Amino acid sequence: QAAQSVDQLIKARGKVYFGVATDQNRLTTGKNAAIIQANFGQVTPENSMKWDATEPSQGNFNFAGADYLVNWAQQNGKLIRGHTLVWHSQLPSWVSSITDKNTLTNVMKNHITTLMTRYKGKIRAWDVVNEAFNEDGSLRQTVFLNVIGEDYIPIAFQTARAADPNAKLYINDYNLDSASYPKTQAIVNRVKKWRAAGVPIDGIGSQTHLSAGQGASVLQALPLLASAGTPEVAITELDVAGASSTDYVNVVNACLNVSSCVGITVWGVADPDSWRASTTPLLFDGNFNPKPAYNAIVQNLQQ
């Protein structure tokens, strides 16, 4: 645990949270729980709310890991971002093999409604649709697009709104880190059009999986994402190859600069537990000590 909490410091600047990805496997080993308690104000399940984890066989849901996370978060005063309802990765084959529109629509709706109803009122925000865009800005040809069609995004969001009207509903994606970039421009254009059509999209989530030196670009990309007119944006899965303080401070400042940016989630606690561990891209090292970039964020946020 670091003495100074980046979550308290960002809250003192008017933001909602500074959080991290975690799950039971992390919380019950090492120093993760104590670090999260001390220094962070929000958690995202790294895996336990994905489709493979929660509905591994159709209609036979497994909530043990998700329940653990939600209960731990409540006990410890941490906000929760649910992650993620509709996504092509970590998707069981029972889903991806379906070729009938009605079948898949009903499966998708039941998955959304069942997860969101279980946690109704406890979840600040859901990543309803994840990684819907290709790198050229076209929509990713996932089973949902291929079988349901264009409607899958409207359906997902409308179903989510009905299941828990309290939750902020997000579309989440990566490579939204440049204002220049076909995916960035596309998500802004399509969110504007979906919302103008009445689709309830409350947030754009920008994963922010960065390479070294790339953080500076977020200072221009995040205000562009905010121009789509959603009530919120958020930095949802931040990590940075090499963990330079310059990159981390740039992303923090981008969020500070964008009033609709509610907060930042970093994608794990300690480097060896990162999905990209070899790049040591997180804010705590393998000995669970805060890294230079953690201290740089603390100092940037001090008033």
Curated annotation (Swiss-Prot):
It is an enzyme of class 3 (hydrolase). It comes from the Eukaryota. Gene3D superfamilies: Glycosidases. Its EC number is 3.2.1.8. One of its GO terms (biological process) is xylan catabolic process. InterPro entries: GH10, GH10_AS, GH10_dom, Glycoside_hydrolase_SF. The modification Pyrrolidone carboxylic acid is found at residue 1. It catalyses: Endohydrolysis of (1->4)-beta-D-xylosidic linkages in xylans. One of its GO terms (molecular function) is endo-1,4-beta-xylanase activity. PROSITE patterns: GH10_1, GH10_2. The active site is at residues 131, 237. Keywords: Carbohydrate metabolism, Disulfide bond, Glycosidase, Hydrolase, Polysaccharide degradation, Pyrrolidone carboxylic acid, Signal, Xylan degradation. Disulfide bonds join 255-261. Residues 3-300 form the GH10 domain. Belongs to the glycosyl hydrolase 10 (cellulase F) family. This is Endo-1,4-beta-xylanase. It comes from Thermoascus aurantiacus.
